């Protein structure tokens, strides 16, 4: 009771309702902005739900499967725009994480909101598909977009990529096919260029992307450690 989770200045039931709601919204929209604390707890729930889904998908035991399904049902409000959410979890959301061991959600710190000074954050699903057909882009993963923007900026400036940026890119790649990733980047890039003032040469851009990918993929003091004399 004391120190197992956040309390969030709400009594039990209400808190539970809030958290379930947040999870549902995250599943719906892929990315949401809220207070930091709320995000932090919401992620815990969401991750657990995802894992349950995964287990249901995998495990042979019928009994286990049923139980997991029940748990999933319990942990959601399947009513309005969440009516088909159960289906979505199994069919669309859970598969993306089949190989990934935990860390399905990403919390990113924003600026504290001006009126209230409450510290804010983005909570979002990790590998969310950025390109929906009959739509162009999707309301996807902010981090990826940010990375792409940074890359573009670097290119514009003709500076080398920051090591941090490279690390981030590598992380993104780890659970991602190369070609797919490249495609995603390309999709992002055009859109970004359109948004910004910058021009767009297709082939050149492609080449740049390829170069970026290559470095990412194929991997490559005053104190002297010495034995006790």
């Amino acid at each position: 009771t004391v120190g197992i989770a956040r309390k969030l200045s709400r009594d039990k039931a209400h808190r539970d309702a809030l958290l379930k709601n947040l999870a549902c919204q995250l599943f719906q929209h892929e990315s949401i902005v809220s207070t930091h604390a709320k995000c932090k707890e919401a992620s815990r729930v969401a991750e657990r739900i995802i894992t349950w889904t995964k287990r249901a998908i995998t495990t042979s035991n019928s009994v286990a499967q049923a139980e997991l399904k029940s748990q999933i049902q319990s942990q959601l409000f399947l009513a309005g725009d969440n009516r088909k959410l159960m289906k979505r979890l199994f069919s669309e959301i859970a598969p993306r994480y089949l190989e990934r061991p935990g860390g399905y959600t990403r919390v990113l710190r924003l600026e504290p909101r001006a009126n209230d000074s409450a510290p804010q954050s983005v909570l979002e699903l990790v590998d969310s598909p950025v390109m929906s057909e009959s739509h162009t882009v999707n309301r996807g993963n902010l981090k990826m977009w940010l990375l792409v923007k940074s890359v573009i900026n670097d290119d514009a400036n003709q500076l080398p990529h920051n090591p941090l940026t490279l690390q981030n890119l590598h992380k993104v790649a780890k659970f991602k096919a190369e070609a797919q990733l490249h495609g995603e980047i390309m999709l992002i890039k055009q859109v970004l260029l359109k948004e910004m003032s910058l021009p767009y040469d297709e082939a050149l851009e492609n080449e740049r992307t390829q170069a970026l990918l290559k470095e990412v993929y194929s991997s490559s003091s005053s104190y002297v450690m010495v034995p006790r004399p």
Binding site: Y223, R228, P229
Partner: protein, 249 residues
């Protein structure tokens, strides 16, 4: 090759005399003190579990003290430092965590960058151990008694009811809005103030505690642990110090 120096007659003719023994001298104080003969070792409180005496079949609550990488770094003497003591280190620590100065110090004494350094004060020069030498749990015998030092769990800001076991007030018989309060905190005008050391709410715990005469139950070099009978102060992973006891030597 002389220098221009003078000298007063008052100071030249002053007969030599030795200053007598001051009680507030370090040397004198040393003599007074009731110190252990041997040294001790630094340990980490890991947890608690039950020891079973196999003959009598009796259950003793025992706390496990882990003696990882304990090593004498250097010692202090009456001539230089005014007391006899050995600085013992415990446990390895990563370069990144250690100050350059401290690294240098460690190098000076051919040890690895330690996790916790502590002096153990001893009686006489005999008690000192050669520096750079390792200590094991085998330094203590099962059955012997030790004195343990560690830092108690912090209770944060505590009321007088919890700190000093004040009785508080009655629960329901008129009593209003003061159920756990300390009551009067002084007398009227004829002190006209609150006396120093009045028991009052405030921080409790996270303080040093010496617990005396604890029995060493077991000592296993293969596991790097000592077993002590009873409860030792502080949380899991707190640094503890054990010396051989003075009351039951």
């Amino acid at each position: 090759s002389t220098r221009p120096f003078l000298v007063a007659p008052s100071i030249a003719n002053s007969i030599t005399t030795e200053a007598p023994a001051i009680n507030h001298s370090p040397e004198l104080a040393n003599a007074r003190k009731w110190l252990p003969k041997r040294c001790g070792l630094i340990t980490r409180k890991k947890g608690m579990m039950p020891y079973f005496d196999k003959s009598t079949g009796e259950r003793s609550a025992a706390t496990i003290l882990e003696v990882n990488n304990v090593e004498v770094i250097m010692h202090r003497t009456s001539e230089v430092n005014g007391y006899f003591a050995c600085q013992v280190g415990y446990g390895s620590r990563h370069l990144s965590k250690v100050s350059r100065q401290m690294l240098g110090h460690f190098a000076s004494k051919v040890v690895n960058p330690k996790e916790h350094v502590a002096e153990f004060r001893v009686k006489d020069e005999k008690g000192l151990i050669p520096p750079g030498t390792l200590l094991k749990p085998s330094f203590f015998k099962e059955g012997q008694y030790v004195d343990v030092r560690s830092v108690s769990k912090g209770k944060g800001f505590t009321g007088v009811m919890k700190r000093y076991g004040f009785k508080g007030l009655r629960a329901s018989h008129g009593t209003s809005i003061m159920h756990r309060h300390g009551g009067s905190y002084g007398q009227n005008q004829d002190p006209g103030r609150v006396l120093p050391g009045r028991k009052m709410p405030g921080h409790m715990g996270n303080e040093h505690v010496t617990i005396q005469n604890v029995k060493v139950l077991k000592v296993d070099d293969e596991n790097n642990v000592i077993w002590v009978k009873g409860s030792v102060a502080g949380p899991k992973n707190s640094f503890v110090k054990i010396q051989d006891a003075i009351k039951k030597t």
